[PDB]
Design a protein around this ligand. Structure first.
Ligand SMILES: *[C@@H]1O[C@H](CO)[C@@H](O)[C@H](O)[C@H]1NC(C)=O
Ligand SMILES: *[C@@H]1O[C@H](CO)[C@@H](O)[C@H](O)[C@H]1NC(C)=O
Ligand SMILES: *[C@@H]1O[C@H](CO)[C@@H](O)[C@H](O)[C@H]1NC(C)=O
Lengths: 114, 114
């Protein structure tokens, strides 16, 4: 039982408009209790891109079988990329509470559009 | 995600001494309640939170009666129980949020006071 690490292997990804982009994230542990969420940007105006609870999120498909307890792959595919989709995507682990608090964020994956 | 056996809405008259809102997860695999977190949301605010890691329930002053049957949690039952007084003053759509380790999900049930 060691502190979870969040791994986004790709520092940056590039893709032509109208095409899809894979955003990789894996975690080393399923503890503590609380969800993984994807955001674009950092700070108070960052945009929620995906979580398991508030879907479906159109254009977003999970790479792995995220309905399985032992799943630690939270990679997603985003279809029909537009210039609005540019920015840094953060895979972020949260702790439960009122409200949930951010526990740890991945390094970030810079997406850009051609 | 945690998956749910959904319900559009439930009813309760003046004869109903206590009101039960159904919430049932179907792919729950929790080994201990410490793995589980439950949120019952209403008009934005959390009217009931169960924190399994801490083994504690939190309610606001208006919702003094709201609670769940903790014995049923590992079965996947996070149904909410409250009396008539709390029910009448808070009629509307309810959101049942459940988290198990990193998996999470929610489902909506509307309370109707016919
Ligand atoms: C649940 O977890 C707690 C804390 O780790 C432990 O004390 C308790 O024995 C566990 N319950 C069961 C039924 O294993
Ligand atoms: C939850 O609290 C009850 C009463 O305080 C206690 O008996 C029970 O052991 C707790 N459950 C745990 C620690 O898993
Ligand atoms: C409950 O939610 C539905 C939307 O799914 C809405 O039509 C209805 O008005 C809501 N009920 C209340 C009391 O707001």
């Amino acid at each position: 039982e060691e502190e979870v690490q969040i791994i986004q292997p790709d520092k940056s990804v590039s893709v032509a408009a109208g095409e899809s982009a894979i955003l990789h994230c894996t975690i080393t542990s399923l503890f503590p209790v609380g969800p993984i969420q994807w955001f674009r940007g950092a700070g108070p105006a960052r945009v929620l891109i995906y979580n398991q609870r508030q879907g479906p999120f159109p254009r977003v498909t999970t790479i792995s079988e995220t309905t399985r307890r032992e799943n630690m792959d939270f990679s997603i595919s985003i279809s029909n990329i537009t210039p609005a989709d540019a920015g840094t995507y953060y895979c972020i682990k949260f702790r439960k509470g009122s409200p949930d608090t951010e526990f740890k964020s991945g390094a970030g994956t810079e997406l850009s559009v051609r | 995600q945690l998956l749910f056996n959904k319900t559009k809405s439930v009813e309760f008259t003046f004869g109903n001494d206590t009101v039960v809102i159904p919430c049932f997860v179907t792919n729950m695999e929790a080994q201990n309640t410490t793995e589980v977190y439950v949120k019952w949301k209403f008009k934005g605010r959390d009217i009931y939170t169960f924190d399994g890691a801490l083994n504690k329930s939190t309610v606001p002053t208006d919702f003094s009666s709201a609670k769940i049957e903790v014995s049923q949690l590992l079965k996947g039952d996070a149904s909410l129980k409250m009396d008539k007084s709390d029910a009448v003053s808070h009629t509307g759509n309810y959101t049942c949020e459940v988290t198990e380790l990193t998996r999470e999900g929610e489902t909506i049930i509307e309370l109707k006071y016919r």
